[PDB]
Amino acid sequence: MSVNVNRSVSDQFYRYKMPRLIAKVEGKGNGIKTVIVNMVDVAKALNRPPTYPTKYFGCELGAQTQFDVKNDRYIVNGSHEANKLQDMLDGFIKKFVLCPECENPETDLHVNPKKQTIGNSCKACGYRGMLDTHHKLCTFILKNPPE
RNA sequence: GAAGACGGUCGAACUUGACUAUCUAGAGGAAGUAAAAGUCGUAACAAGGUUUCCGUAGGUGAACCUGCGGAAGGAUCAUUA
């Protein structure tokens, strides 16, 4: 299987396409993990560091997240099988990088970590601005600027 | 001595701009209370495993942590030339 990057658009010819995201449920009750297997390839296909899309699930779900250089596992704590992610797999696009003028997420970020500001720019119609101040992930991005 | 006309004086109503009082519709946003077999933790109650609480300021998935100055409603009404 393969998919469009976002399912709010039903078009077969939509500009954005990527591999599936698949995960393992591991352990037993009071200590369950969900580990995301494709995360480095999905982060490469979306042109972002793999910390940002992993951190967004913990911000929405109300859950802990882990990262590890010794084992390369990316983890969201608790059981999040099937619909518990797959109803909202669009979200890292749908709550950040859709343009309000047109539904075309051909979109870039630049971080000014010395001055508490994240700049945003979409190629599709020239839409520019910043990320939202009520939204969760802004406090993580300013402490973790892009490569 | 009839119709009619100039001038005053009451003043309904009409046009135009502004102010204002009630009721009423709405993209989208952000909160509160019912219900008690959803999810991730374990902040408070026994020294609750870092005593707790107040004012103010900064910081984070969340409960919350840290700096400065107070309170006991404390876990001491007491410590010896």
Side-chain angles (χ1 to χ4, degrees):
Chain A
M1 292 184 179
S2 64
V3 292
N4 289 354
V5 166
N6 164 34
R7 288 157 55 207
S8 72
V9 177
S10 59
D11 187 4
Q12 182 174 125
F13 314 113
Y14 190 53
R15 179 163 170 67
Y16 316 85
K17 296 182 187 286
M18 68 177 187
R20 282 293 199 176
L21 183 146
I22 302 173
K24 294 180 179 181
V25 181
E26 302 191 334
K28 277 183 283 152
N30 298 347
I32 302 176
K33 296 171 184 172
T34 302
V35 180
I36 306 170
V37 186
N38 307 95
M39 182 56 75
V40 181
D41 291 336
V42 174
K44 186 177 177 185
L46 299 184
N47 306 297
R48 294 297 183 271
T51 54
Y52 298 177
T54 307
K55 184 70 175 189
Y56 171 65
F57 301 130
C59 297
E60 297 280 78
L61 296 170
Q64 183 174 89
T65 65
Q66 302 175 232
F67 328 114
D68 186 4
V69 176
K70 304 174 183 177
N71 300 290
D72 302 284
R73 293 160 84 187
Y74 294 83
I75 320 185
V76 186
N77 295 65
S79 202
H80 303 294
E81 73 290 346
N83 292 89
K84 295 174 178 170
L85 288 178
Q86 294 174 9
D87 289 356
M88 298 196 293
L89 184 62
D90 309 317
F92 188 60
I93 279 74
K94 192 176 181 179
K95 300 191 184 177
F96 294 88
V97 288
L98 295 180
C99 168
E101 308 190 35
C102 63
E103 202 163 9
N104 294 304
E106 193 161 3
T107 311
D108 301 317
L109 299 176
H110 173 80
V111 186
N112 292 330
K114 296 185 177 183
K115 296 191 178 184
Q116 303 300 121
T117 303
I118 304 162
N120 172 26
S121 58
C122 189
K123 295 190 176 75
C125 67
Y127 179 78
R128 294 188 175 199
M130 63 160 64
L131 295 184
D132 177 81
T133 66
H134 183 209
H135 195 57
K136 272 73 173 181
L137 193 68
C138 303
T139 54
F140 187 74
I141 289 162
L142 283 162
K143 192 167 286 188
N144 299 272
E147 299 188 308

